[PDB]
Design a protein around this ligand. Structure first.
Ligand SMILES: Nc1ncnc2c1ncn2[C@@H]1O[C@H](COP(=O)(O)OP(=O)(O)OP(=O)(O)O)[C@@H](O)[C@H]1O
Ligand SMILES: Nc1ncnc2c1ncn2[C@@H]1O[C@H](COP(=O)(O)OP(=O)(O)O)[C@@H](O)[C@H]1O
Ligand SMILES: Nc1ncnc2c1ncn2[C@@H]1O[C@H](COP(=O)(O)OP(=O)(O)O)[C@@H](O)[C@H]1O
Ligand SMILES: Nc1ncnc2c1ncn2[C@@H]1O[C@H](COP(=O)(O)OP(=O)(O)O)[C@@H](O)[C@H]1O
Ligand SMILES: [Mg+2]
Lengths: 67, 1490, 320
C-alpha cells in the first residue's frame, strides 16, 4: 500500500493528490528541498462539513480519506 | 511644419529600409531561378510579400509589410546557414550583409564593401567590363590577378568568390616565383621593389637570405655577406626619401626585414665555434623551398628548431612589420613547437608586451591573415562554438585575444570542442561535429589564445583546457632594440644613443615618480611616442627636438603636479636642450574664438589643457579624460571640438553615451535565444550607421563618441580590439566592424581605481590636476549663460558690479569651516546661486520700473545675499546657518538680511506676519495633506518653491520624519503648475521602474520627446530614498547615474530601439537621509553637482508642542469639557517622544527608529478612539491616551526590561504633567467588539466572547485546537485595532507557532475581510507573483471586496518580490503591473465599473485617483516574520516603505505567564489528582506558576 | 621518519588502476587541487583495459543534455563515460545526478572535481568511491613510474628525459628556495620534450647529437614556457646543463651513473640494462637535498615544518 514520491520529480502534486484521495501511505524522499504546496498537509489543518474532510493543496481542494 | 517634416523623414527611413529588404528578398528568391523550389511554404510567403509590395508600390505611385518581412526572416535563417556552408568566409558577415551579398545578382558592386569584413586585408575589387582584373589592399596597394575572371549574370556569388579566392593564391605564388627567379638572376632589390607586391618580395628575400646563409655556413666566413647586406640596407635607406607613399611603406617593411637579416648575420659573425653558429642558425626562422613539389601552393615550407610549417600563400597587403626582438624569435619558436602537434599556441603576461602583435607577425610570416577575436562575458557556449565552427571551415588562424574574459563555465564547456579540433587535426579527420552538425575541417586551421592573468574580474583557466595549449611567458619585451631599429628606419642620424636615451628616460620616469595606478610606461607608450614623432619630422626635422617634443606631447598630459616637475627636470638633464616651441597661432585663435562663442574664459590652465588635448588627439584615437568632479572636462572637449571644426572646416557629430546606465546587452547587443538572431545595441548601431554611409554624410565629417561614466572593466575592456592597433569590433555573432580613421572615442570619468592597466595604456590619457576655471570666471560664465537663456542691460551691469570678488573670495574661504551633508566643493555650488539670483531678478523685474536706484540696489543685494545663503549654507545645521548669515552680513550700507527676512508685494518683511490662523476641525486630522504652518515650515516651503521655479534639481536631505515630503506636498498642493509622482527606491531599483512610473504620466511624441500628458502643467519627478539603490561590485549606481543623465544632458537613450529622447517638462526632486545613517551609501559628486541640497532638521521641542497642541485643540473640539487639557497632553506626548528617542536607540535593536510619525499616529489613534467612543471622563481620557501610547511606541520593544522601563516612563510622565489605576499593557483593554462604541472592556467577558467567536470560526472555516490566553487577547486586540484603520498594515515578528497567521485570519473573519494567501512555492517565478498581486488588486478595487493579504517571510523567494511589495506599500498600486494592453484593459474595466456605480468620472487622472483611493481604503496587508536575524528578514525590516507604513508589533517569545496559562487551561481537562501529593519547599523565583 | 611507519608496518598500496579494478561500485570520483589534472591517467587506464571513454565536460546546458543522453545510452549497452569539472554544474549534479545514482556490467562513470571548489552533496559523494590524484613525491618512484609508462639513442634520451622530469618535479615543490613561485610541470611537457628528442634524433643520422640544441630547446621552449622569472629560467638551464651535458660519464645522482650506449646493441637489451641500473639505485634519506644539489638549511626547514604539522595533527587526533 505504500507509495514513494520525491520533491525533485515532476508530477509530484498529481500523484500526491491521487494518493490522498485513495488513502495510501506516502513517503517523500529528499526532505531538504521541501515544497511549500504541502504546507497544509504539514500543518494538519482540516475543514469539516458533515462526514467529509477537505484539504486545499495548491489550487484545488482534495478530500482526506482518513487513513 | 517641423513635426510634419520629422514624420516625413521617419516614413522615408522606414520606406528605404523596407525597399532594401524587398530588394534583398527579390534577389534571393524573387529573381533567381531554381531557388524557390527549396522551401515551398517560404516561396508562397515570398509571393504574398511580392503581391503586397506591388500593391504598396502602385498605391505610392498613384509597417505591416516590414512586419511581414521580419516574420519571414526567420524562415530564411536556415537558408542563410546553408549559404554560409557553401562559402566558409560568410561566417564573418551578418544577416543583412548576407542578404545584400546574395541579392547582388548582376550588379557585382556590393561585394567590395563587405570584402574587408570577409578577407580582412582587401578593401575593394577592380572591375573592368564585367570582369575582375585586380584586387586592392587596405593600404591602397593593387595586386593584378594572373587570369581575368569572366563574370556572367546567371552565376551567383559564392562560385566566383571561390574562384577569386583560388586566383588570389595563384597570383601571389606566380609573383613570388617570378620575383625569386629575378633575384636568382643576380639583380639588386632596388629595381625589384618597384614591380611586384610586398609579400612576394619579402618571401623571395627571405628565401635568398636563408640560402646564402646556408652557403656561408658550409664555409666559415661571414664578412662579405655582412658587407653586402649593409650596402643593401643603406641603398634602401637612401631610396626611401625619393619614393611615393606606397613605395615608402614597402621600403620601410623591407628595411625591417633586412635589419633583421643584418642582426642575424652579425650574431653569427661574432660567434666563436661552429657548433654555437649552428645553434644560433637553428634558433632563427628559415624559409626553405621544395625543389620536387609538383603542387604549386605547397612548394614553400618554413623550418624552425627542426619542425616544419607550410606556407599558405594568402594576400596580406602592407602590414606594420614588427621589429625582430629575441623575445619575438623565441615566441615564434614556441608557436612552431605548439603547431607541430596541432595544439594551440598561448601567450600570457602583463598587458602591452606584444602578444597579439606577435601572433599577427607569425601569421604574416606564414603568409596568412590571423583573424583576431576579442572574448567577452556575453560569449556563451553557443557563440564560442559557432565562432570555432566558423574558423574550422575557413582554415584561418583564430587568435582569441583576452581569453580570461570568458566565464569559467564557458571555459569548461568549450574544452571538449577544443580537444575535438586538436584531435581532428592530429588524426587527419575530414569532418568534425559541433552543434550536432557535421562540417568540413580545413587542415590549415589553428587556434591561439593571449590571456592576461593576474587581474581582478577575470576567470582562471581549468586544467583540462590549459593542457591543450602551450603557453609562453611574455613579461618583459625589448624596448631598446625596437626603438633603435624604428629610429634607424625613420632616417634619424643618431639611432643607438637616441634609443638608449629614450629607454633610460622612460625607466627613470617610471622609477622616480609617484606610484599611483595610471603611470604605466611600457611598450605601448613607446610606440605612441614614436608614432607621434613620425609626423613632426616635417616641422622639427630628424634629431632630438622632434623626440623631446613628441615625449612632451605624449606623456605630459597624463602627469600630475609634482610629477610634471620631475618630468621637466629629467628631460632637461638627460637631453641636451629643448627646441623651439610650436607657434600654434591659428589653433589658439580658434580656441579663443570658440570660447568667446560659448562664453568661457581663457585662463592659463584651461588653454594649456585645450592645447594638450588637441595635440594628443591629433594622432591618438581614444582619449580618457580624468580629474576631479566638476573640473571642466566636458567644457574642455566641447570647446576644443568647436575650435577644431572652425579650424579644419569639418562638421562634427557627437554621441554622448552614458555607459553604466545601460546593460551590456543594451550597449553592444544581445542575441535572442528563441531565434538565434542578432539584435543591435547602441554603440554597435552607431558604428554600423557610421560605416554604412546610407546618405554619405559622414564622408568628411568626424565622429566623436563620449563614454561619460565610470570606467568599468567589464564594459570598457570589451572594446580592447577597438582601442588597440587592431581597430576592429568583434561581435558575438561574427560580424567584424572596422573603425574608420576619423571615428574617435572619448572617455570622461573621475576615478581610475577600478580600471585595469590593459585599458589604460591603449588610450591616450589626460589628467586634470587642478580646476581649469577660476572662481570669478565661473560666476561670469554662469551669469552670461543665464542671461543668454532669457532695462536689461542696466540690470545686467549692476548685477555684475554687485559680485565684488574681494569679498567673494573671503566668503568662499569662510564657507569651508562649516559642516556639510553630502560633501560638495564650493566650486560646484555656484550653479544654484547664480540660477536662483537670476530667477529672482527676472521674477521681480516686472516691479522694477517704479522705484528709485537705492531701493533697487538694496532689494537686489538682499536677494543676492539670500541666494548665496541658501546655496552655500543651505545644506547645514540651523546654528551653522545663523553663523553663515551673520558672516555674509558682516562681509557686505547695504540692506541687511536677517534670519527670517523676506520680501512681499516690494517691501522687506518677516515670516512672523506670514503665519496665518488655522481653522483645523476635528475630522481633518486624518487627511495627510493637512499641515500646520510655522516659521520654519513656511520658510522651507518658500525656498523649495523658489528653487523649483528656477528649473533646477532639488535634493531634500534630513533625518527621517523631518518633513521632506510634507513640505513638498504642501507646497505643490496649492499650485496648479506642477504634478507630483511618487517613486520610492529600494536596494534593488532599476531604470525600468522609473520609466514605468512615467509611461502613464507622459506621452512619446516625435518632433523623440517625453512631454507630459497635460499641456499647461509641468511634472515633478519625486524620487525618494536615493541612498537606497545599492552599488555593484565596481562602486557605481545605475539609478543615480540615470538621474545625473536626466538632470545634465536632459534626456536618456531608449534601450530597445536605440534612439535618443529629449526630456522637456520634467523636474527631478530627490529625498534622502544623511550618509551617516546605517544602510545608506555615499553618492558620487557627479550627481550632487547638478542639484541643490537642503538640510531639513527636526523641529524644536517647543515647536512640536505648538503643532501638537493645535492638533489636540482640533481633536478636543469634539469634547468641549476638556478644552483646557489640550496643552498638558501636547507637553506629555512631546516629552514621551523625546524620552523614547533618547533612551531606546539603534544600538539596542535595529528597528528602534522613532520619528514625529509616531506622534502623528498617536494623535490619529486618539481621534479614532474619541470619535468612535462614548462620553469620556478625565480618567477614561488618560487611560485612552495611555493605551494609544502603548500601541504606538511600545509595540516595537522586544525586552521585558524595555517594557517595564516604558511603563515606569508612562507613570512618570502622567504624574508630572497630569495630576487612575494600573496602566500596564495587561491592564489596558480597549476594544469595539463587545459594544457599538470603542469603550474600555473587562477581561472575563471579552475572553468568553472571543471563545464563542473562535468556536464559531473553527466550525465555519477550519478546525484548529488553540487555547485563549491573556497575551493573545492583547495581541488580537491590537491586531484588530490596526486592521480597523484606513490604510493600516502590520509586521508581526515572533517565533513560529506562537500564532500569527491564524490570529490574522481570525481577525479578518471577525471584520468581514477576505483572506488571500499567495501560493508561492518551489520552482515559482516573479510572473506568478505578478498574477497573484494583480488578481488581488482587481478583486479589491473592481469587486469592492475588502481583502487582507498575508505575506509570510518564506513567500519572498527573491529580492525582487520584496521590491514589488515595497512598491505596493509605498504607492497604492504597481506601475509595472498595468502597462500597455493591460493598462488599456484596466482603464476599460475601470470605466465600466464607474459607469455601473454611477459616478461621472471621465478623465484619466480622476479615474486613476479613484482607483488609488479605493485600493488604499479596501486593502490591508499583514506580514509574518519568523526569524528576524536572517538576511531576507533583516532587509524586510530595514526596507524604507515597509518600516515607515507598517505598525511593527513584536510578538516575541512566550513568557512564562503565557506558558503557565496555556498549560493549565489544556491539562485541566484530564484527571490528574488520583494520588497523594506533598507540597515541596521551593523558592518564589524557582516556581513560575501560582 | 614519517615514511618509516608506511614502509615498515604497511606492505602494499593501491594506485588508480588497482582501486578501479577492485571495486564493486560502478561510479568513481577523483578530486585534485588547482593546477593539476588526472584526465590522462584515465585515458591511459582505459587504453590499458581496452575501453573507450566519453569525455563530457560540464558547464553548459548543451553539454548537460549530451551527458544525460550518453549516460542513458551507456547504461543501455555499456561503455565508459567521464565527466570533467562537475562543480560547474552544481544544480544538475544536485538534482539529476543525485536522482540517477540514488535509483550493465561494463559501465563505469568517473567524475573529476576540485578540492578547493564548492562542496559536493554528501549523499552523492558517500555513494561513490573516492580517489585523490597527486604526483608521486619520491624521486626514484617518479623515475620508475615514468619509465614504466613507456634506435637505442632514443631510449637513452627517454631515460635522461624521465630523470630530468622527476628532478624538476621534485624541485618545484620547494617554495622559497627551489623556485620563486608554484610551477607545476604536467605530462604534456614531458610528451612535447620526448617528441622533440625523437625529431632531433630522426633528422640527425650522423650520431653527432646536438646537445646544445636539446639543452636550449628544453630549458627555454618546452620546460621554460611557464617560467616567468629570470632566476627560475637560470636554474632550469643549470639543471638541463647538468642532465643533458652529453658525456660518456654522467653522474646525475651521487650513487647512480649512466654509461652511454654503444654502437652494437639493440633496443630490448638497452631497455633491460637501463631498467637494471635503475633498480639498483637506493634512495637515501637526504634525497630531497643531495640529489637536487641544494643547501641543507632550506630542505631541513621544510621537512621540519611538515613533520611539526603532521605530528601536531596526529597528537590532536590521538587524544580523543
Ligand atoms: N574656462 C571656463 N570658463 C568658464 N566656465 C568654465 C570653464 N571651464 C569650466 N567652466 C564651468 O565649469 C562647469 C563644470 O564643467 P563641466 O561641464 O566640464 O563638468 P564635467 O567635467 O562634465 O563634470 P563631472 O565630471 O563632475 O560630471 C561648466 O558648467 C562651466 O560652467
Ligand atoms: N616588435 C614589437 N614587438 C612587440 N610589440 C610591438 C613591436 N613593435 C610595436 N609593438 C607595439 O606593441 C603593442 C603590442 O600590443 P599587445 O601587447 O599585443 O596588446 P595585447 O596585450 O592587448 O595583446 C602594439 O600596439 C604594437 O604597436
Ligand atoms: N506642522 C507640522 N510641524 C512639524 N511637523 C509636522 C507638521 N505636520 C506634520 N508633521 C510631521 O512631519 C512628518 C512627515 O515626515 P516625512 O516627510 O513623511 O518623513 P520622511 O521625510 O522620512 O518621509 C509627519 O509624520 C508629521 O508627524
Ligand atoms: N494558545 C495556543 N494553544 C494551542 N496551540 C497553539 C496556541 N498558540 C499557538 N498554537 C499553535 O500554533 C500553530 C499556529 O501557528 P502559526 O501562526 O501557523 O505559526 P506561523 O505564524 O509561524 O505560521 C497552531 O498549529 C497551534 O497548534
Ligand atoms: Mg590583447
Amino acid at each position: 500500500k505504500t507509495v514513494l514520491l520525491s520533491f525533485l520529480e515532476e508530477g509530484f502534486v498529481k500523484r500526491l493528490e491521487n494518493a490522498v484521495r485513495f488513502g495510501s501511505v506516502v513517503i517523500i524522499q529528499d526532505g531538504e528541498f521541501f515544497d511549500p504546496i504541502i504546507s497544509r498537509l504539514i500543518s494538519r489543518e482540516f475543514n469539516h462539513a458533515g462526514n467529509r474532510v477537505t484539504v486545499e493543496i495548491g489550487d484545488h481542494e482534495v478530500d482526506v480519506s482518513g487513513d | 511644419l517641423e513635426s510634419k517634416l520629422t514624420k516625413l523623414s521617419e516614413i522615408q527611413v522606414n520606406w528605404v529600409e523596407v525597399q532594401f529588404y524587398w530588394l534583398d528578398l527579390y534577389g534571393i528568391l524573387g529573381e533567381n531561378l531554381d531557388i524557390q523550389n527549396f522551401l515551398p511554404l517560404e516561396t508562397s510567403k515570398f509571393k504574398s510579400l511580392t503581391s503586397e509590395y506591388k500593391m504598396i508600390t502602385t498605391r505610392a505611385f498613384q509597417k505591416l509589410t516590414i512586419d511581414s518581412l521580419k516574420m519571414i526572416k526567420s524562415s530564411l535563417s536556415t537558408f542563410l546557414e546553408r549559404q554560409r556552408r557553401q562559402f566558409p568566409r560568410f561566417y564573418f558577415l551578418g544577416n543583412d550583409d548576407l542578404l545584400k551579398i546574395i541579392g547582388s545578382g548582376k550588379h557585382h558592386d556590393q561585394v567590395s564593401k563587405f570584402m574587408k569584413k570577409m578577407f580582412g586585408s582587401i578593401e575593394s575589387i577592380i572591375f573592368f567590363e564585367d570582369s575582375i582584373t585586380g584586387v586592392r589592399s587596405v593600404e591602397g596597394e593593387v595586386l593584378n590577378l594572373n587570369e581575368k575572371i569572366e563574370l556572367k549574370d546567371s552565376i551567383q556569388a559564392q562560385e566566383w568568390l571561390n574562384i577569386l579566392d583560388t586566383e588570389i593564391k595563384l597570383s601571389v605564388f606566380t609573383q613570388f616565383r617570378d620575383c625569386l627567379g629575378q633575384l636568382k638572376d643576380g639583380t639588386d632589390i632596388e629595381v625589384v621593389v618597384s614591380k611586384y607586391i610586398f609579400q612576394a618580395i619579402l618571401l623571395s628575400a627571405q628565401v635568398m637570405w636563408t640560402e646564402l646563409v646556408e652557403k656561408c655556413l658550409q664555409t666559415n666566413e661571414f664578412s662579405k655577406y655582412w658587407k653586402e647586406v649593409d650596402m643593401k640596407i643603406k641603398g634602401l635607406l637612401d631610396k626611401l626619401n625619393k619614393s611615393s607613399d606606397n613605395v615608402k611603406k614597402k621600403i620601410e617593411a623591407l628595411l625591417v626585414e633586412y635589419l633583421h637579416f643584418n642582426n642575424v648575420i652579425g650574431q653569427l659573425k661574432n660567434c666563436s665555434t661552429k657548433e654555437e653558429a649552428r645553434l644560433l642558425w637553428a634558433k632563427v626562422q628559415k624559409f626553405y623551398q621544395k625543389n620536387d613539389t609538383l603542387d604549386d601552393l605547397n612548394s614553400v615550407f618554413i623550418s624552425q628548431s627542426g619542425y616544419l610549417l607550410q606556407y599558405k600563400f594568402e594576400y596580406i597587403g602592407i602590414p606594420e612589420r614588427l621589429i625582430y626582438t629575441p623575445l619575438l624569435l623565441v615566441g615564434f619558436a614556441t608557436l612552431t613547437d605548439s603547431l607541430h602537434q596541432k595544439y594551440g599556441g598561448c601567450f600570457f603576461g602583463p598587458a602591452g608586451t606584444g602578444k597579439t602583435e606577435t601572433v599577427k607577425a607569425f601569421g604574416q610570416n606564414l603568409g596568412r591573415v590571423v583573424v583576431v577575436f576579442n572574448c567577452d562575458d556575453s560569449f556563451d557556449y553557443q557563440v564560442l562554438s559557432r565562432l570555432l565552427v566558423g574558423i574550422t571551415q575557413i582554415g584561418a588562424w583564430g587568435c582569441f585575444d583576452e581569453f580570461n574574459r570568458l566565464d569559467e563555465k564557458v571555459l569548461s564547456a568549450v574544452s571538449a570542442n577544443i580537444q575535438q579540433i586538436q584531435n581532428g587535426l592530429q588524426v587527419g579527420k575530414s569532418h568534425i561535429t559541433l552543434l550536432e552538425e557535421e562540417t568540413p575541417l580545413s587542415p590549415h586551421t589553428a587556434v591561439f589564445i593571449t590571456l592576461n592573468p593576474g587581474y581582478n574580474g577575470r576567470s582562471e583557466l581549468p586544467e583540462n583546457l590549459k593542457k591543450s595549449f602551450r603557453e609562453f611567458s611574455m613579461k618583459s619585451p625589448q624596448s631598446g632594440t625596437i626603438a633603435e631599429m624604428i629610429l634607424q628606419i625613420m632616417g634619424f642620424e643618431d639611432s643607438k644613443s637616441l634609443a638608449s636615451k629614450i629607454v633610460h628616460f622612460l625607466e627613470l620616469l617610471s622609477s622616480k615618480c609617484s606610484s599611483m595606478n595610471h603611470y604605466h610606461f611600457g611598450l605601448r607608450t613607446l610606440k605612441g611616442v614614436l608614432r607621434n614623432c613620425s609626423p613632426l619630422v616635417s616641422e622639427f626635422g630628424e634629431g632630438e627636438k622632434t623626440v623631446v617634443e613628441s615625449l612632451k606631447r605624449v606623456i605630459l598630459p597624463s602627469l600630475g603636479d609634482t610629477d610634471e616637475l620631475v618630468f621637466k627636470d629629467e628631460l632637461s638633464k638627460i637631453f641636451d636642450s629643448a627646441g623651439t616651441p610650436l607657434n600654434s597661432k591659428a589653433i589658439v585663435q580658434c580656441l579663443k574664438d570658440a570660447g568667446q562663442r560659448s562664453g568661457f574664459s581663457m585662463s592659463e590652465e584651461f588653454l594649456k589643457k585645450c592645447m594638450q588635448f588637441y595635440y594628443m588627439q591629433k594622432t591618438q584615437q581614444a582619449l580618457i579624460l580624468v580629474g576631479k568632479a566638476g573640473c571642466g572636462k566636458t567644457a574642455t572637449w566641447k570647446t576644443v571640438i568647436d575650435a577644431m571644426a572652425i579650424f579644419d572646416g569639418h562638421a562634427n557629430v557627437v554621441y554622448v553615451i552614458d555607459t553604466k546606465v545601460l546593460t551590456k546587452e543594451s550597449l553592444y547587443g544581445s542575441m535572442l535565444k528563441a531565434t538565434l538572431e542578432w539584435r543591435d545595441g547602441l554603440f554597435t548601431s552607431i558604428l554600423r550607421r557610421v560605416n554604412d554611409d546610407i546618405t554619405g554624410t559622414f564622408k568628411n565629417s568626424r565622429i566623436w563618441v563620449v563614454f561619460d561614466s565610470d570606467l568599468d572593466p567589464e564594459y570598457v575592456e570589451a572594446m580592447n580590439s577597438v582601442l588597440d592597433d587592431n581597430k576592429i569590433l568583434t561581435l558575438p555573432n561574427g560580424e567584424r566592424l572596422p573603425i574608420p580613421p576619423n571615428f574617435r572615442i572619448l572617455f570622461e570619468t573621475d576615478n581610475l581605481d577600478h580600471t585595469t592597466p590593459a585599458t589604460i595604456t591603449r588610450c591616450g590619457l589626460l589628467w586634470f590636476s587642478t580646476d581649469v576655471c577660476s572662481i570669478s570666471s565661473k560666476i561670469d560664465h554662469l551669469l552670461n549663460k543665464s542671461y543668454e537663456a532669457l532695462e536689461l542691460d542696466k540690470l545686467k551691469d549692476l548685477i555684475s558690479d554687485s559680485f565684488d570678488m574681494a569679498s567673494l573670495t573671503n566668503i568662499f574661504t569662510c564657507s569651508n569651516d562649516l559642516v556639510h551633508i553630502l560633501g560638495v566643493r564650493t566650486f560646484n555650488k555656484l550653479e544654484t546661486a547664480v540660477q536662483l539670483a537670476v530667477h529672482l531678478i527676472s521674477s521681480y523685474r516686472q516691479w522694477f520700473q517704479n522705484l528709485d536706484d537705492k531701493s533697487l540696489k538694496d532689494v537686489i543685494t538682499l536677494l543676492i545675499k539670500r541666494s548665496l545663503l541658501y546655496a552655500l549654507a543651505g545644506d547645514s545645521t540651523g546654528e551653522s546657518q545663523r553663523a553663515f548669515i551673520q558672516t555674509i552680513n558682516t562681509y557686505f550700507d547695504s540692506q541687511e538680511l536677517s534670519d527670517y527676512s523676506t520680501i512681499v508685494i516690494l517691501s522687506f518683511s518677516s515670516f512672523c506676519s506670514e503665519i496665518p490662523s488655522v481653522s483645523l476641525e476635528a475630522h481633518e486630522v486624518m487627511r495627510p495633506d493637512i499641515v500646520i504652518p510655522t516659521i520654519d515650515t513656511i520658510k522651507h516651503e518658500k525656498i523649495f518653491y523658489d528653487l523649483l521655479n528656477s528649473k533646477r534639481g532639488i535634493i531634500l536631505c534630513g533625518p527621517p520624519g523631518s518633513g521632506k515630503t510634507m513640505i513638498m506636498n504642501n507646497a505643490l498642493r496649492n499650485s496648479s503648475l506642477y504634478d507630483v509622482v511618487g517613486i520610492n527606491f529600494s536596494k534593488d531599483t532599476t531604470t525600468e521602474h522609473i520609466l514605468s512610473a512615467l509611461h502613464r504620466h507622459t506621452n512619446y511624441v516625435t518632433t523623440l520627446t517625453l512631454l507630459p500628458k497635460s499641456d499647461i502643467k509641468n511634472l515633478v519627478l519625486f524620487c525618494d530614498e536615493i541612498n537606497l539603490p545599492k552599488l555593484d561590485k565596481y562602486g557605481s549606481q545605475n539609478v543615480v547615474l540615470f538621474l545625473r543623465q536626466l538632470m545634465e544632458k536632459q534626456g536618456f537613450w531608449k534601450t530597445p530601439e536605440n534612439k535618443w529622447v529629449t526630456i522637456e517638462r520634467i523636474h527631478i526632486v530627490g529625498a534622502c537621509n544623511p550618509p551617516t545613517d546605517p544602510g545608506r551609501i555615499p553618492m558620487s559628486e557627479r550627481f550632487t553637482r547638478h542639484a541643490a541640497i537642503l538640510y531639513l532638521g527636526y523641529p524644536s521641542g517647543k515647536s512640536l508642542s505648538q503643532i501638537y497642541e493645535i492638533y489636540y485643540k482640533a481633536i478636543f473640539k469634539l469634547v468641549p469639557e476638556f478644552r483646557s487639557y489640550t496643552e498638558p497632553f501636547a507637553r506629555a506626548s512631546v516629552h514621551l517622544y523625546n524620552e523614547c528617542k533618547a533612551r531606546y536607540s539603534t544600538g539596542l535593536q535595529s528597528h528602534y527608529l522613532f520619528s514625529p510619525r509616531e506622534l502623528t499616529r498617536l494623535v490619529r489613534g486618539v481621534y479614532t478612539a474619541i470619535n468612535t467612543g462614548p462620553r469620556q471622563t478625565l480618567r477614561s481620557l488618560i487611560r485612552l491616551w495611555a493605551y494609544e501610547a502603548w500601541r504606538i511606541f511600545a509595540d516595537r520593544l522586544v525586552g521585558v526590561k524595555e517594557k517595564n522601563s516604558f511603563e515606569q516612563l508612562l507613570y512618570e510622565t502622567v504624574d508630572k504633567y497630569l495630576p487612575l489605576g494600573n496602566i500596564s499593557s495587561t491592564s489596558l483593554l480597549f476594544s469595539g467588539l463587545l459594544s457599538l462604541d470603542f469603550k474600555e472592556v473587562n477581561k472575563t467577558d471579552l475572553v468568553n466572547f472571543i471563545e464563542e467567536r473562535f468556536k464559531t470560526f473553527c466550525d465555519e472555516e477550519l478546525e484548529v485546537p488553540m487555547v485563549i490566553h491573556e497575551s493573545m487577547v492583547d495581541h488580537i486586540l491590537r491586531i484588530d485595532r490596526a486592521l480597523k484603520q484606513v490604510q493600516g498594515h502590520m509586521m508581526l515578528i515572533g517565533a513560529s507557532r506562537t500564532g500569527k497567521t491564524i490570529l490574522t485570519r481570525f481577525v479578518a473573519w471577525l471584520n468581514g475581510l477576505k483572506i488571500v494567501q499567495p501560493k508561492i512555492h518551489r520552482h515559482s517565478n516573479l510572473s506568478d507573483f505578478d498574477m497573484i498581486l494583480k488578481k488581488a488588486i482587481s478583486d479589491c478595487s473592481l469587486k469592492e471586496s475588502r481583502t487582507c493579504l498575508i505575506i509570510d517571510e518564506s513567500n519572498i523567494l527573491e529580492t525582487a518580490f520584496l521590491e514589488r511589495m515595497n512598491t505596493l506599500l509605498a504607492n497604492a498600486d504597481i506601475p509595472d503591473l498595468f502597462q500597455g494592453e493591460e493598462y488599456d484593459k484596466l482603464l476599460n474595466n475601470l470605466r465600466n465599473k464607474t459607469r455601473s456605480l454611477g459616478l461621472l468620472l471621465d478623465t484619466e487622472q480622476e479615474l486613476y485617483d479613484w482607483f488609488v483611493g479605493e485600493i488604499a481604503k479596501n486593502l490591508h496587508v499583514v506580514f509574518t516574520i519568523c526569524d528576524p536575524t536572517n538576511n531576507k528578514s533583516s532587509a524586510m525590516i530595514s526596507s524604507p516603505a515597509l518600516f515607515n507604513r507598517c505598525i511593527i508589533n513584536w510578538m516575541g517569545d512566550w513568557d512564562t505567564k503565557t506558558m503557565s496559562q496555556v498549560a493549565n487551561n489544556m491539562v485541566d481537562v484530564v484527571p490528574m489528582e488520583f494520588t497523594d501529593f506533598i507540597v515541596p519547599e521551593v523558592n518564589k523565583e524557582l516556581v513560575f506558576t501560582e | 621518519a614519517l615514511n618509516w611507519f608506511k614502509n615498515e608496518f604497511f606492505v602494499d598500496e593501491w594506485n588508480i588502476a588497482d582501486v578501479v579494478a577492485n571495486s564493486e561500485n560502478n561510479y568513481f570520483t577523483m578530486a585534485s587541487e588547482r593546477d593539476v589534472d588526472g584526465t590522462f591517467k584515465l585515458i591511459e587506464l582505459a587504453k590499458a583495459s581496452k575501453e573507450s571513454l566519453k569525455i563530457i565536460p560540464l558547464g553548459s546546458i548543451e553539454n548537460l543534455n549530451y551527458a544525460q543522453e550518453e549516460i542513458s545510452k551507456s547504461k543501455i549497452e555499456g561503455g565508459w563515460i567521464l565527466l570533467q569539472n562537475i562543480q560547474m554544474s552544481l544544480s544538475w549534479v544536485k538534482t539529476y545526478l543525485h536522482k540517477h545514482v540514488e535509483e550493465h556490467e561494463k559501465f563505469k562513470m568517473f567524475m573529476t572535481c576540485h578540492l578547493t571548489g564548492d562542496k559536493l552533496p554528501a549523499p552523492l559523494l558517500q555513494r561513490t568511491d573516492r580517489v585523490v590524484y597527486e604526483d608521486i613525491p619520491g624521486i626514484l618512484d617518479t623515475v620508475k613510474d615514468l619509465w614504466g609508462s613507456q634506435g637505442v639513442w632514443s631510449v637513452y634520451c627517454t631515460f635522461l628525459l624521465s630523470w630530468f622530469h622527476a628532478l624538476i618535479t621534485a624541485r618545484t615543490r620547494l617554495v622559497p628556495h627551489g623556485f620563486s613561485k608554484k610551477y607545476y610541470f604536467n605530462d604534456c611537457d614531458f610528451q612535447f620534450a620526448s617528441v622533440y628528442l625523437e625529431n632531433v634524433l630522426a633528422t640527425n643520422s650522423t650520431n653527432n647529437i646536438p646537445w646544445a640544441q636539446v639543452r636550449d630547446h628544453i630549458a627555454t621552449i618546452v620546460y621554460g614556457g611557464k617560467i616567468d622569472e629570470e632566476k627560475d629560467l637560470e636554474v632550469v638551464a643549470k639543471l638541463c646543463a647538468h642532465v643533458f651535458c652529453g658525456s660518456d660519464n654522467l653522474q646525475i645522482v651521487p650513487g647512480v651513473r649512466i654509461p652511454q650506449p654503444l654502437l652494437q646493441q639493440s633496443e630490448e637489451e638497452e631497455r633491460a640494462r637501463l631498467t637494471a641500473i635503475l633498480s639498483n639505485t637506493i634512495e637515501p634519506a637526504d634525497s630531497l637535498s643531495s640529489w637536487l644539489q641544494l643547501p641543507r638549511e632550506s630542505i631541513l626547514d621544510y621537512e621540519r615544518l611538515q613533520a611539526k604539522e603532521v605530528a601536531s595533527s596526529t597528537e590532536q587526533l590521538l587524544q580523543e
